[PDB]
RNA sequence: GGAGCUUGACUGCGAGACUUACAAGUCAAGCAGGGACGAAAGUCGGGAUUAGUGAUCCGGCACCCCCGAGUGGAAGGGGUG
RNA sequence: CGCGGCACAUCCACCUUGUGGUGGGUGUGGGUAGGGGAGCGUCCCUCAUUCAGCGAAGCCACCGGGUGACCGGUGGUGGAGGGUGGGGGAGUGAGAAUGCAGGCAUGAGUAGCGACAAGGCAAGUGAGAACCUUGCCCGCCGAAAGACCAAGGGUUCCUGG
RNA sequence: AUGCCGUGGUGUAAAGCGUGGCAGUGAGACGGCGGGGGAUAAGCUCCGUACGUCGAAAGGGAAACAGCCCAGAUCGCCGGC
RNA sequence: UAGACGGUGAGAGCCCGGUACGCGAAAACCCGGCACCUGCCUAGUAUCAAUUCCCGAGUAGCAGCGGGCCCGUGGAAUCCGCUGUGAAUCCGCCGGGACCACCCGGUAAGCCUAAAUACUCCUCGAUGACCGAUAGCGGAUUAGUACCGUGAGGGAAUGGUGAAAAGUACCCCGGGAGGGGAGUGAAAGAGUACCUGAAACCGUGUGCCUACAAUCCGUCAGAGCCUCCUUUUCCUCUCCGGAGGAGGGUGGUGAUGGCGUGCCUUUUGAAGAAUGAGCCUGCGAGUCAGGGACAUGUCGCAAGGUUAACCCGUGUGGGGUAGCCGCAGCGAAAGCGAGUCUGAAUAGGGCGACCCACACGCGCAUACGCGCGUGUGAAUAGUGGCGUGUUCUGGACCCGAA
RNA sequence: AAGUGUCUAAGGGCGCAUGGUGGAUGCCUUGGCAUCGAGAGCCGAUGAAGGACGUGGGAGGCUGCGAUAUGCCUCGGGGAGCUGUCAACCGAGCGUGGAUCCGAGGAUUUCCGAAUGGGGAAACCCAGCACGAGUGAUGUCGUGCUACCCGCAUCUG
C-alpha cells in the first residue's frame, strides 16, 4: 500500500550524488591493535558497492 | 471519430497469462522447480543464513542533525541566463520566474560568471557568489 | 464476465475426435485417449514419411536386383554399369521399366555389362 | 652468528595491480610530517614469508566549538583512537 | 546434394538511402528449465457497418482452407440473436491435483437376498398367486419366538380403496 | 608433452566486454584418459580433463538398449551420394 | 417537456402499463410560520493603589512497579494505572523531551457542548463492460429446508411445454403404465418424464473385415470387397440413360508387409512392475488494490512535470499549488559550494562539477590544440499518466496437514 | 491322382443410418451479489424481537391474522370486478347504494418468550385477593392486579 524502506540497510548504505551506493569498508571497529595502519587505511572509507551486491541493496534502499 | 482511434504501436502490450498450456508458459509459469520459489517467494533480506550485506556491514558513521538548515540554491551563471537584463531581482522574483520552489530560504551559488548588471537579494551568499555579483556592477544583499 | 468455457474447448475436442475416427478401442470414443493416440499417430506418420522414402528405395532395390539376376548380373555390377555408362535413371523408374519392359531392362543390363572395366582390380 | 646505537612495533596517504560470489584478505612504488641508523647511498609504516584470530549490533575509556529539542549550559549523542 | 514451400539474423543495391516494404548473397531454423517476439479462440462495452422468423446462437453431418491455435462454406436440427472493421475490458482456454458436482460405464446379470424353525395341499380372489384370504395337514417357540406395562417412537391403530 | 599468460600476424558472424530487466540451476548419469578411497572390486564413491554424450537429441548401427559409434530433424518428394 | 423501461403471438415513441411534465392528501409524522406561557438584568462595567481572602486535594509532585507513546526502562520527557510519602492558590503550580538558571505558552485535580466523521437491520429510487441455475446469497424450486449430530453446531439438492392449456375428446392394444390412429397447435422434430438436446453410456440395422493367430492397439506401403460418382467399348431406342462393365475419382472397411516401449508428475534414468487418472459434461490455479520500488514500450509538457483531500458539474468535466519529485554536491555534522571531506599540506585521495570537424583573439607549438565565453548555433531532462515484466505489504498461483 | 479356389459369424472391430439415457451448450429469469443517492436509525413491563397453537367451507405449506383470528371500526384514495397464493380444482357468495385493492389512525391482539403471581421438559401445570357471572350449593367461568432490584414519598423502627 506504501512501500517500506528496509531500515537496517538504509542506516548502512548511502546513495551518493549520482547512482552509486557507498557501503562502509569497516572491519575497522573492534580490534585495531594487531591491525597495521596499512590494514586500516585499507579499512577507512566508503566503498562503492560492487555489481554482485547492487540489485538487492537498492531494493533494500527502497 | 471513435472508429478511427488507435494507440501508438509500441504500447498496449499483451498480458502474460502463464499457466495456459505448455506452448507458451505452460505448467510452472517461470518457477520451474519444486524448490521454495516454486510456491512462495524468498525475500531480498534472506541470504541463506550467513549475515546479509545489511547486517555484516556497519551502520554509517555519524548522526543526522535534527536542525539541518537546508536551503535552496540559485545559480549565479544561471541567474544570468535567467535575467539577461536583470537590474532588479529578489527571492520572490526567482520563484516567480521559476528558478526555485516556494517556502524557501535561498543561497546563491557561484558556477559561471554572472555578466549581467544585477543586484540580488537572498540569504547566505557564498564566496564566489558575492565575488561575481559584486563584480558584475551590482552587489549582494541579505 | 464469466465465460462458460464450453465452446472454446469443444472446438478442439471435435477436432481430435473427427481426426480420430476409425480407432479400435476407447480411442475414437473418448477424448483424452483420442488425444494420446493423435500424438502417437502423428509421430508415427512423421516417422513413416521418412521411413517410406527409405523403404521404397529398398523395395525398388530388391526388384532391380531380381531383374538383374534374371539377366545373370548382380545388382552391384548393374549399378556400377548404369553409373559408368551414366544413364541417370534412378531405382524407381529403373524398377518400373524392370516390371513392364523386360526388353528395356535387358537393354539396360547389356549397357551395364558393356560398362564394366575388366575385373576385380582397378 | 656477533657488536654498536636506537623505536619506523610511526601520523596523514596512496598510483597500481594479486585474489575475490559478496564480506574479508595481501602487496604496494612513491608523496609530506616529524624520527632512527649511516660519512653518505639509502633502508626502516615490526619479525625470512605464510597460522597465532571473529563480522555486526551493543556498552565502555580518553582527545576534538561536531550537535546540543525556547536560549545559555548540560545529560545524551557524534567523530578519532 | 537435387528440387520445391515457410521462418529467423546480418548485409547491401533500392522505394521516402534509420521507421516499414522490392531484389539478392550468406548463415541459420532439435530442444528441457527458462528468456524474447508474434498470434488463435471464448465472452462482455463503445464506435462503424452488416446478416437474421425468408431463420440468430447452440448442436450434428459433410466439403473445403490456414504453417499452428484454428477458419469458412453447405446441408440437417432449432426457433432469437450473431457477423466483421477500429478499440476498451476479461471469472479467457484443462488431460491430470487419490481435484468438485452430475451422469454413465468395467466387475456383472456376477455376489448376495440378513440365522440350521419347515413347509405344503385343496379352494378363493385376481389381468397376474410359492409368498394374499379361507381351511386342513405338518412343523418351531413355550422362563419365550406368549401376555402385559415403563421409557422410546408418534398414528404405524381400525375401515375403504 | 600438454595446458596456461602475453604479444605478432592471418582466419572466423554476435563470439567478447560493460550495464540493466527476466529467469532458471545448484540431487547429475555413463563413457575416454589422469588420479584418490575400495581389495589390483562394483552399474561404487570422490576428484581433474576448451573431453564426449545423455540430461535436453530424434534418425542409422549396437538383437533389444538414455550415456557406446555415425549423425544434430524447418516442412514435402514413390529422387541421388 | 414523452425515442426511459417493460409487456402484447417477433425487434413497438404512436396497442398496453407508463415515462417527460403536471396535479396529488383526510389523518398521521415531520419541516417550519405567528401569538401565549415561561428565562434574565432595577449598572457598578469602568480606573485605583492591593489592606485581605479565593481560583476544584490524599490531587499534583517525588520514589517503587507497570502500561502507553516512534521511543523495547533506554539517559526520556508528556500521559495513564496501583502502592508509599505527600503540597501550595498567582511572588501558586503546569508545560516547553532528563535537569538547572533566564525567556515563552497555559492555568490540571468540575461538568457540558451542534457541525463536518463512520455505520446499515430497514424502506424508497437507480445503475452496472455484475452472475444468469455447477453461476450469483447456503438459499430462484416449501431453505437455514430435508437430512447429519446428544449438543454446540453442519447443512444440501431441486428453475424452462406452449403465444394461448387450446394438456391429446374419440376408437384401438393393455389389468395399468404405455403406446397407434385421430385431433389441438405454426411445430408433438413442443406430451404435463415437456425450450435447444452435447458427450460418456446403452441398443437396432447395414458395407467391409475377423474363428492358424499375438504384438501401446496406431502409422506407412497396400490387394480386394461395398460406396456414390462418373469418361467411354457400348446400346444409336442419342428424339429420352445407364447395364456386365474398361479408365477415373472421393468414402466405409481393410487381407497382407515393414516401423513402433501410452499421457502426466517427478527423475542420472520411466513403456515402466514409480505417482495420478474408470469415462464423459460442467466447474479448478499466477488476480487485484497502492498519487507503492525497480526496469522498460508508448504519450502528454519542458527546467519542469504533477496534483492529494476537497469545491462546482449530471457524461469524468472544470477549479484545487498543500505536498512529492527534478533543479548541487560534499561532509559525522557545524558548515561550504562546483566544489566538498580527511589532513599540518594540497601532495594525494574519496565523493561530483562539464560536451565539437573551427573559430575571436592570443600563452606556446616541430604538422601540435589544452585554454575562455560569446557562436560556427556548444546539448539535451526530467516529471506525470497508460501498457509490460519483476519485486513489496496484503491469504497473493491453487490445493494439503499434524 | 496331384494342385488351386472364397464363401461360414457363435460373436467381435470399424464407419455410417436410426433410436434411447443424460442434461451440457445456447437463450432466458418470478433470484442474488456490488454500489450510488434520500431517508430512517432503535424496539420492549402500555410486554419486544423470535416463535408455539390456532384461524379459511374442504388437506397441508407459504402468507395474513389472533378465540372479533386471510379479519373489525373511522378517516382518505380508486373504481369494476372480487373470493391472498403452491395449485387449480368443487362449492357458496358479495359488488356500480361502491366491492376486492391501496395509504393513515384505532380496536382485537391466545400461549411462550426480559416473562415478571408460583412452578416448568419454552409455548404448559397450579394459585391469592378484588370486582363480575353461573349452580340448589361448592366446583366452574369473565375482567384486573400480584416478580425482582435500585431510586423516591410516606408510617415505621
Automatic annotation (TrEMBL), chain A:
GO terms for molecular function: structural constituent of ribosome. InterPro entries: Ribosomal_bL35, Ribosomal_bL35-like, Ribosomal_bL35_CS, Ribosomal_bL35_sf. Keywords: Ribonucleoprotein, Ribosomal protein. GO terms for cellular component: cytosolic large ribosomal subunit. Residues 1-21 are annotated as: Disordered. Gene3D superfamilies: 4.10.410.60. One of its GO terms (biological process) is translation. HAMAP family: Ribosomal_bL35. Belongs to the bacterial ribosomal protein bL35 family. NCBIfam families: rpmI_bact (TIGR00001). This is Large ribosomal subunit protein bL35. It comes from Mycobacterium tuberculosis. The lineage of its organism: Bacteria, Bacillati, Actinomycetota, Actinomycetes, Mycobacteriales.
UniProtKB/TrEMBL annotation, chain B:
GO terms for biological process: translation. The keyword rRNA-binding applies. One of its GO terms (molecular function) is rRNA binding. Residues 1-7 have a biased composition (Basic and acidic residues). InterPro entries: Ribosomal_uL15, Ribosomal_uL15/eL18, Ribosomal_uL15/eL18_sf, Ribosomal_uL15_bac-type, Ribosomal_uL15_CS. Keywords: Ribonucleoprotein, Ribosomal protein, RNA-binding, rRNA-binding. Residues 1-38 are annotated as: Disordered. One of its GO terms (cellular component) is cytosolic large ribosomal subunit. Residues 73-141 form the Large ribosomal subunit protein uL15/eL18 domain. Belongs to the universal ribosomal protein uL15 family. Binds to the 23S rRNA. Part of the 50S ribosomal subunit. HAMAP family: Ribosomal_uL15 (MF_01341). This is Large ribosomal subunit protein uL15.
Automatic annotation (TrEMBL), chain C:
InterPro entries: Ribosomal_bL20 (IPR005813), RIBOSOMAL_L20_CS (IPR049946), Ribosomal_protein_bL20_C (IPR035566). GO terms for molecular function: rRNA binding; structural constituent of ribosome. One of its GO terms (biological process) is translation. Keywords: Ribonucleoprotein, Ribosomal protein, RNA-binding, rRNA-binding. CDD domains: Ribosomal_L20 (cd07026). The keyword RNA-binding applies. It comes from the Bacteria. One of its GO terms (cellular component) is ribonucleoprotein complex. NCBIfam families: rplT_bact. Binds directly to 23S ribosomal RNA and is necessary for the in vitro assembly process of the 50S ribosomal subunit. It is not involved in the protein synthesizing functions of that subunit. Belongs to the bacterial ribosomal protein bL20 family. This is Large ribosomal subunit protein bL20. It comes from Mycobacterium tuberculosis.
Amino acid at each position: 500500500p506504501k512501500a517500506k524502506t528496509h531500515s537496517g540497510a538504509s542506516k548502512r548504505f548511502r546513495r551518493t550524488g549520482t547512482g552509486k551506493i557507498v557501503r562502509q569498508k569497516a572491519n575497522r571497529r573492534h580490534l585495531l591493535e594487531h591491525k597495521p595502519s596499512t590494514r586500516t587505511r585499507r579499512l577507512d572509507g566508503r566503498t562503492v558497492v560492487a555489481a554482485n551486491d547492487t540489485k538487492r541493496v537498492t531494493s533494500l534502499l527502497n | 471519430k471513435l472508429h478511427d482511434l488507435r494507440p501508438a504501436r509500441g504500447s498496449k502490450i499483451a498480458r502474460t497469462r502463464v499457466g495456459r498450456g505448455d506452448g507458451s508458459k505452460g505448467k510452472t509459469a517461470g518457477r520451474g522447480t519444486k524448490g521454495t520459489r516454486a510456491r512462495k517467494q524468498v525475500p531480498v533480506t534472506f541470504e541463506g543464513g550467513q549475515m546479509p550485506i545489511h547486517m555484516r556491514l556497519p551502520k554509517l558513521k555519524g548522526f543526522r542533525n535534527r536542525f539541518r538548515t537546508e536551503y535552496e540554491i540559485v545559480n549565479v551563471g544561471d541567474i544570468n541566463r535567467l535575467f539577461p537584463q536583470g537590474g532588479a531581482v529578489g527571492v520572490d522574483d526567482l520563484v516567480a520566474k521559476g528558478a526555485v520552489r516556494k517556502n524557501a530560504l535561498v543561497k546563491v551559488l557561484g558556477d559561471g560568471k554572472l555578466t549581467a548588471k544585477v543586484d540580488v537579494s537572498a540569504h547566505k551568499f557564498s564566496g564566489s557568489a558575492r565575488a561575481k555579483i559584486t563584480a558584475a556592477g551590482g552587489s549582494a544583499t541579505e | 464476465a464469466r465465460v462458460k468455457r464450453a465452446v472454446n474447448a469443444h472446438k478442439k475436442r471435435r477436432s481430435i475426435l473427427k481426426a480420430s475416427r476409425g480407432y479400435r478401442g476407447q480411442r475414437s470414443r473418448l477424448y483424452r485417449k483420442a488425444k494420446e493416440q493423435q500424438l502417437h499417430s502423428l509421430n508415427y506418420a512423421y516417422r513413416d514419411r521418412r521411413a517410406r522414402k527409405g523403404e521404397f528405395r529398398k523395395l525398388w532395390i530388391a526388384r532391380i536386383n531380381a531383374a538383374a539376376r534374371l539377366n545373370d548380373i548382380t545388382y552391384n555390377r548393374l549399378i556400377q554399369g548404369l553409373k559408368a555408362a551414366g544413364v541417370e535413371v534412378d531405382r524407381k523408374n529403373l524398377a518400373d521399366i524392370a516390371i513392364s519392359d523386360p526388353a528395356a531392362f535387358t537393354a539396360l543390363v547389356d549397357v551395364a555389362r558393356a560398362a564394366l572395366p575388366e575385373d576385380v582390380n582397378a
